[PDB]
Amino acid sequence: LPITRKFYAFYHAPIVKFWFNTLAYLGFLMLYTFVVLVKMEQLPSVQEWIVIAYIFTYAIEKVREVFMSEAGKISQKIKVWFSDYFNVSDTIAIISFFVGFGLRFGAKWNYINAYDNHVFVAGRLIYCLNIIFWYVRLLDFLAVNQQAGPYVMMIGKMVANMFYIVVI
Amino acid sequence: VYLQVKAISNIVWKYQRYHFIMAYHEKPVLPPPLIILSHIVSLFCCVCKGPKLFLTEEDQKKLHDFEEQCVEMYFDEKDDKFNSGSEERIRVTFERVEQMSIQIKEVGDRVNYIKRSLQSLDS
Amino acid sequence: QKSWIESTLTKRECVYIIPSSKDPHRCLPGCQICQQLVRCFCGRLVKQHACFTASLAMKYSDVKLGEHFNQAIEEWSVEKHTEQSPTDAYGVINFQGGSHSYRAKYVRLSYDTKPEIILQLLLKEWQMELPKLVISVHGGMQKFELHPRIKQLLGKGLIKAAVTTGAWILTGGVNTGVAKHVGDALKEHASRSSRKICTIGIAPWGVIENRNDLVGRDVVAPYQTLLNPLSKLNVLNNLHSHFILVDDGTVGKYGAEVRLRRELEKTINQQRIHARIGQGVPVVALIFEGGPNVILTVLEYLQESPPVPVVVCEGTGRAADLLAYIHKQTEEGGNLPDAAEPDIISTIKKTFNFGQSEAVHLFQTMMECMKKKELITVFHIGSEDHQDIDVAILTALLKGTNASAFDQLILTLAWDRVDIAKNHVFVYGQQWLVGSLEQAMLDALVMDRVSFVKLLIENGVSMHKFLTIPRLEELYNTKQGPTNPMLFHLIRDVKQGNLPPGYKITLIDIGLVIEYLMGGTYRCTYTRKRFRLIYNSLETKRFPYPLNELLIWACLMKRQVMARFLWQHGEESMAKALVACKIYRSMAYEAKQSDLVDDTSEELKQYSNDFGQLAVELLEQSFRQDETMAMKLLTYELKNWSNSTCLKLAVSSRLRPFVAHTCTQMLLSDMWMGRLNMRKNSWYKVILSILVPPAILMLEYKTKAEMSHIPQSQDAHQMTMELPITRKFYAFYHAPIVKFWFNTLAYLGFLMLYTFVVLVKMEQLPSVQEWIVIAYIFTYAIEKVREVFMSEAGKISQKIKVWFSDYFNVSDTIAIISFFVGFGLRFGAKWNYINAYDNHVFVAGRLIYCLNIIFWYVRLLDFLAVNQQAGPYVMMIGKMVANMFYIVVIMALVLLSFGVPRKAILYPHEEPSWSLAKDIVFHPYWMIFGEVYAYEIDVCANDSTLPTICGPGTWLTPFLQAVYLFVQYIIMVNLLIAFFNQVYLQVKAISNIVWKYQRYHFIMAYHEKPVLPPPLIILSHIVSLFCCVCKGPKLFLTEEDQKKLHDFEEQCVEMYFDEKDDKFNSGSEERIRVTFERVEQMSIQIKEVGDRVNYIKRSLQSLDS
């Protein structure tokens, strides 16, 4: 196979698109985690800008995933993509981070001590909680394996079929 | 409830593996920090400029032949898996042996007439 | 042109015109209605002959104006008045409406076509293989009628003979004749849809119905099932596959059967039946009620050269009956009994409705038909006369056609059918040629016909006699069978890349493959200096044990069904099966690695575990007879398999169920004992007798009789050839159980000192204890080196690959290397002379000790697993740690899902630090173990240990943690419990087997270990070193005992088969099968009596009256 057709066949492989997103997402969770733990000044650090960039561009990937879906009438496109645990959890996590970035960038910043503007405080605690949507998503990646998938697909069927013991 | 959720959860997994693979098979190459490039390319050009199993007409026939034979076997095997089973051979055996009893005893009668005959014909 | 059919074949058709019967019927002016109706002698309506040149004559009436010598026309020359052109009717019938739509196919050619063309397209274009029989059914073709038994039974044969020989039944095609009748059989049987009989049934395009439906080039046809009551044109019969529709160039006419159905028959009989075989493909002629023409056609095949035989049938109709009728009257053929020589002509009259001049003419044909009664037969369904027309058909080609039993057999070989030859070739008083039996075994082996191998080896063909170098050597060099295309791969590997053009495989080569497949040091006979000589020189050119040499062939070339057959024969049955399990297991590994197409590996892995399961099932059949001899079987030097052992082969194939049998464990115990009888003695006494040497003299040992089944070294054999006091010590100390309890009590005296050093302070120089500690490890390390260099394996790269495939030999390497980093930095240091633990070098070297210790307590599981109860539980902790890696990663997301928000919400001023890598992982890990940090939740509360962490957002952590533990203590930690509880039997069952297997490698390591433990072992090293520079076990039998053991194996094999045959024949499922099949047959033989008895009654009601 020639050199030019020997790249195109790699990059347009599903396994490659996976291990080329995982290593990005696992480089997103290592920066976001860094932002969440480390203090946060008036303006986003280089890391936090890259964090917003992923989510934003990721959100666009989730819109185009809807409009260019197989389904027909939009009301049916908006009924298969929301019948998915992680596409809801993205919606909740993309909408929430932009409540967080809204109240974090959009704030008065007392200039004496942060965490004296409850607006600023709020927008962070949105970040520090939205994070749970993004570690839990690694089960979308970890379930690729023939051994791990099932154990991920059991934690739904054990949480569901024990609601009644847990009320007792 | 472990076996009966582990058996299912394999099947729900192997089913969801379809919707997952066939989403990367239409996903951009480039990940969601740099995907915006592949979006602008597709956007810019779609305003300006799924998979298929491409067979040759010869292979459409060879595959068509494959389906035909494989159907024919499915029936020819199950018919034998039924006729070869013991429960079925007991049924036939039973129903024969019923019929056999009949066609023997009527001979048993008839033979008893050919005997009392020859005991008296020539005498 | 794109189509080889019409590119080659052509269609003939009338091009001139010849008015057939000029005289018009009615409608006073002839001119129009004459031409409109009066057909050409061409065939169809004269007006229909388009073919433009004729149509510029049809314009007025015809060619050759009106009268214009009306007599002159009257021939329709089928070359001048009839030109041909490329075919435009060749396609595929679909038989519109057919109940699963059975298919066929058609062409349309000119009868002058030569058979080379019909044959080549048949086998190229239509893509078939040459058959192995041609049943050309030249019978009567008048839609005739039969009785059910002969409608039904006669097919049971005819189908069967043709599916068992891949035949091509060659009918007349049409559904109003012999074609119609075979279809009645073809459907009643259905051939269990497959590539069954590939019936041809050649007929014309002239008498055919719906010719216009299937016109066009390579075109599907809507050919329809027209059972219109009159329909002068006829349908092709249903079940017939491939058709030919030879267009003479005329509707209505006949003749497009014989011009080709002659040539085809001869032309197939001209071709070779198979690559190996060199006969002509057989032709057999079947007759269903024939006719005036057929009864001559019958005669023609009798008169052909080759004399193609015929098969007729009593009770299909006129001809088959009469040919069977005169077969009764005529005796010898030459006779005709003259008392009835027109009395048959009385019958010849009534059956047909013949006349007189033809009556003798039929009778004439009957004579030459009988003149050779030799090559013709009859089917008497009414009696037991060679039942099931198969045998008659298959047989008839052998009885009549003069051919040697070789030439007979070799045909039956091609037809994969012994039952014929078993009862019609291998019959009484036969002229069996000297080498024909041999030359046939050459063919049955290569072609994979085990059934004829069995047949020939029964009738007498010694493998010892039929197994030279040249014979055997080419059996590899054949493609004429189910070849493994992988054998050529392993060869080109061991040649290191070399690959000549044709490459005659030599027996040097097969040896080097087996040396490579069996591994270790397995030297085949094919590579030894002796055999290398004689191979470069060519009964001394024979092999002693052939079925040991073919069993390799049958397995290298992946011919399982041959391998098992060649296994039950011969001798050394257990050994052979375990070699096969290694070869297949070894080919599978090379297939996976070196792929080219479909792995065939699971095909081989199934082939290994089949043999490898016979050995296990052959052993138990020997362990249940005499457990003693069945332990000698596992140990006697084989001498045909590289001086190896029936057990060292199982271990080589990782065949756990054999080493984990209860005979391979009672032997290993008997070696674990040694010369000790530890069923009387007790483990108390050994531990005493070690620390009390003179208590050895009160231990009850075993006699040389009780150590017959126990393989020994040379020296112990000598101490039993040449008990005294001096031989009563040597037998103790050189016991494996003693070498164990004499190392444990050292190692357990090492761990009690090392532990003392680790805990107690450590001054500048090692204390007496720590010197003894170093001594053990050092001398122990030497024991681990010599354990490698003097290992069984060959090339060092393989010695350095088995000793590192062991959990504790790695852990030693890590622990011996590490302690000498520790002793290096502990002895090699400056020692501040004010306080230790102020030299980080010294500190370091200790913490190496205090951590290396974990390698040395964990090793007591190598000692504790000796027990039959503890071993498994030790061999489970591997299979539970392995098969839960994936729950435990899910348990680490949840940990950081919680640890990152909490350290973010509670400590919101943290500069970058390494503490942000502990405190996101630290407390959330100790929560899994029930430490809730209850006075650190709700840090703003009044009972808090963290009243300074109170700030914005810190009310969220009680919720996160609630969610956390519900996952990490109720969902997930109780998912483990449910994991283990449900994977317990299936790991406990295994872990027993993995333990009982590893007990081999453990015992047989003390059986080559020094007596003296790793503090004092250095003495036994220097002794062996000093002397080896200056100066495994064997089961020593006497020649008499080699025979008694040989007898033991023989009988035990014979029972294994004789028992399983009865366990199958005694089972209910099998008795139902027979009962069923009998009771079917019984129904038949009763009801026929029920008939017959009903005739003997109506008789006697009227005879005397």
Ligand SMILES: CCCCCCCC/C=C/CCCCCCCC(=O)O[C@@H](COC(=O)CCCCCCCCCCCCCCC)COP(=O)([O-])OCC[N+](C)(C)C
């Ligand atoms: C695929 C489908 C699923 C995904 C859905 C995707 C859509 C996501 C849905 C989003 C809807 C959620 C609400 C909007 C977010 C802001 C809300 C907010 O509080 O704003 C604040 C900031 O408002 C500003 O104007 C300043 C900061 C810039 C706004 C950036 C947010 C919009 C980005 C959206 C990009 C989305 C596009 C993504 C690409 C498609 C207003 O409050 P404040 O000014 O801070 O208050 C000052 C108070 N003080 C003066 C007393 C201190």
Ligand SMILES: CCCCCCCC/C=C/CCCCCCCC(=O)O[C@@H](COC(=O)CCCCCCCCCCCCCCC)COP(=O)([O-])OCC[N+](C)(C)C
């Ligand atoms: C910084 C962070 C701040 C926020 C933190 C707080 C986060 C709170 C945590 C939230 C937990 C989120 C996980 C649950 C996801 C849904 C599960 C699912 O898919 O169920 C089912 C969806 O069934 C349907 O019928 C589809 C529509 C229902 C969607 C449910 C929306 C829940 C919204 C909650 C709003 C929460 C928002 C709260 C916050 C304002 C599964 O599929 P199905 O049943 O087969 O689908 C029907 C298909 N069918 C008809 C063909 C069969």
Ligand SMILES: CCCCCCCC/C=C/CCCCCCCC(=O)O[C@@H](COC(=O)CCCCCCCCCCCCCCC)COP(=O)([O-])OCC[N+](C)(C)C
């Ligand atoms: C006091 C505390 C109380 C407990 C608190 C809450 C804890 C519990 C969680 C609560 C979250 C709310 C979602 C509940 C799930 C609903 C759906 C379900 O049950 O199963 C359904 C799918 O299930 C899923 O898609 C998700 C299953 C839940 C996973 C929980 C997250 C684990 C990791 C979080 C780590 C966080 C750690 C850090 C936290 C800071 C499947 O059900 P089914 O039977 O197959 O039905 C058919 C489905 N069908 C319609 C699509 C065909």
Ligand SMILES: CCCCCCCC/C=C/CCCCCCCC(=O)O[C@@H](COC(=O)CCCCCCCCCCCCCCC)COP(=O)([O-])OCC[N+](C)(C)C
């Ligand atoms: C079967 C196969 C598996 C087993 C493998 C068996 C082989 C084992 C493999 C071993 C490889 C591991 C490395 C070698 C060990 C020393 C490393 C080290 O740090 O040395 C140190 C001591 O160096 C000295 O020279 C002083 C002490 C004597 C050296 C004794 C160690 C060698 C013994 C080996 C006997 C092995 C043979 C055993 C018998 C066969 C160097 O550092 P330092 O001088 O302390 O630093 C001073 C710094 N300061 C001045 C600032 C304070």
Ligand SMILES: CCCCCCCC/C=C/CCCCCCCC(=O)O[C@@H](COC(=O)CCCCCCCCCCCCCCC)COP(=O)([O-])OCC[N+](C)(C)C
């Ligand atoms: C944050 C903490 C996280 C947990 C920490 C880590 C803890 C866990 C341990 C980690 C150690 C790393 C080794 C893991 C084992 C891998 C191999 C395996 O799974 O099984 C394999 C063998 O297994 C063995 O030979 C060893 C099994 C592990 C025993 C663990 C030590 C127990 C005692 C420690 C006491 C320490 C107490 C003191 C501590 C100071 C068998 O697997 P299989 O399926 O049969 O496959 C076929 C094998 N075949 C190829 C040979 C044919």
Ligand SMILES: CCCCCCCC/C=C/CCCCCCCC(=O)O[C@@H](COC(=O)CCCCCCCCCCCCCCC)COP(=O)([O-])OCC[N+](C)(C)C
């Ligand atoms: C269940 C049966 C039990 C009862 C039910 C009754 C329900 C009624 C509940 C009512 C809640 C509202 C009243 C409280 C607000 C008053 C103000 C206050 O104290 O603020 C405190 C914040 O504390 C909170 O905000 C408390 C938590 C609010 C959410 C409650 C859970 C949602 C319902 C359940 C759903 C969950 C989802 C489950 C997911 C699976 C601040 O005070 P502080 O703490 O001292 O810190 C400040 C210190 N500083 C100023 C120095 C920095």
Ligand SMILES: CCCCCCCC/C=C\CCCCCCCC(=O)O[C@@H](COC(=O)CCCCCCCCCCCCCCC)COP(=O)([O-])OCC[N+](C)(C)C
């Ligand atoms: C969105 C997807 C992107 C794709 C990812 C790649 C793009 C991301 C690339 C670069 C991003 C950063 C560039 C800007 C400048 C960085 C400065 C900085 O932080 O320096 C710090 C290192 O860096 C960190 O501590 C944070 C970044 C590295 C670790 C986290 C991400 C790694 C994973 C992603 C990559 C591997 C993937 C792994 C998984 C497969 C060092 O400084 P400090 O720690 O402050 O201390 C210094 C000492 N002092 C303070 C005393 C002076």
Ligand SMILES: CCCCCCCC/C=C\CCCCCCCC(=O)O[C@@H](COC(=O)CCCCCCCCCCCCCCC)COP(=O)([O-])OCC[N+](C)(C)C
């Ligand atoms: C930057 C430099 C490069 C290195 C960076 C990257 C390092 C590596 C990255 C990740 C760690 C795991 C690597 C193992 C992959 C092995 C291959 C494999 O088989 O993958 C499998 C799973 O494929 C997955 O992608 C599984 C999920 C991993 C990504 C998500 C993070 C989960 C780990 C974090 C969780 C928190 C734990 C936190 C712990 C502190 C897919 O194949 P298979 O199942 O074998 O398929 C079977 C059949 N088949 C083989 C025929 C197809």
Ligand SMILES: CCCCCCCC/C=C\CCCCCCCC(=O)O[C@@H](COC(=O)CCCCCCCCCCCCCCC)COP(=O)([O-])OCC[N+](C)(C)C
């Ligand atoms: C490598 C393998 C070799 C084979 C092993 C045998 C060879 C090893 C032989 C002898 C080694 C010691 C000889 C040197 C001098 C010892 C001095 C000493 O320590 O005295 C102490 C006893 O001893 C101990 O406390 C440590 C040694 C004995 C216990 C640990 C090993 C026992 C196991 C091995 C043997 C049984 C095996 C059991 C399991 C099967 C007593 O002094 P103290 O404790 O300091 O207190 C005194 C009071 N004072 C301080 C107030 C004054």
Ligand SMILES: CCCCCCCC/C=C\CCCCCCCC(=O)O[C@@H](COC(=O)CCCCCCCCCCCCCCC)COP(=O)([O-])OCC[N+](C)(C)C
């Ligand atoms: C110096 C003065 C003398 C006293 C010192 C010596 C004392 C004794 C030494 C050790 C204690 C155990 C002794 C039991 C032995 C009984 C005999 C036996 O059957 O052994 C078995 C196991 O053989 C072993 O060797 C098991 C492992 C013990 C040595 C390693 C230490 C593990 C225990 C410590 C771990 C740390 C725990 C910490 C706890 C605080 C072997 O035989 P079997 O399984 O019966 O075989 C079944 C079939 N058969 C019978 C037909 C063949």
Ligand SMILES: N#Cc1ccc(COC[C@H]2O[C@@H](n3c(NCc4ccc(Cl)c(Cl)c4)nc4c(N)ncnc43)[C@H](O)[C@@H]2O)cc1
């Ligand atoms: N290859 C591959 C592959 C890749 C990813 C996945 C994960 O698939 C996620 C989808 O799987 C769906 N899903 C799931 N998801 C399991 C799950 C999701 C999230 C979490 Cl935190 C957990 Cl504790 C478990 N369970 C389902 C069920 N019981 N019935 C039907 N659908 C289920 C869910 O809607 C979600 O959208 C599965 C397979």
Ligand SMILES: N#Cc1ccc(COC[C@H]2O[C@@H](n3c(NCc4ccc(Cl)c(Cl)c4)nc4c(N)ncnc43)[C@H](O)[C@@H]2O)cc1
């Ligand atoms: N008789 C006897 C006898 C004596 C000792 C042993 C101990 O086992 C020794 C070997 O056993 C091997 N082994 C083991 N060892 C188990 C083990 C070893 C160490 C530890 Cl700490 C633990 Cl938690 C468990 N598991 C194996 C497996 N699942 N498959 C194949 N081999 C396995 C391992 O390589 C180790 O070297 C086993 C039997």
Ligand SMILES: C[C@@H]1CC[C@@]2(OC1)O[C@H]1C[C@H]3[C@@H]4CC=C5C[C@@H](OCCC(CO)CO)CC[C@]5(C)[C@H]4CC[C@]3(C)[C@H]1[C@@H]2C
């Ligand atoms: C998939 C998983 C997602 C979460 C996670 O794993 C992978 O992502 C990782 C990224 C890590 C951080 C990267 C860089 C640094 C900088 C360093 O700066 C030293 C400065 C100074 C000290 O004084 C030198 O002198 C401090 C540590 C820190 C913040 C890491 C902490 C652990 C983190 C958060 C890891 C976390 C467990």
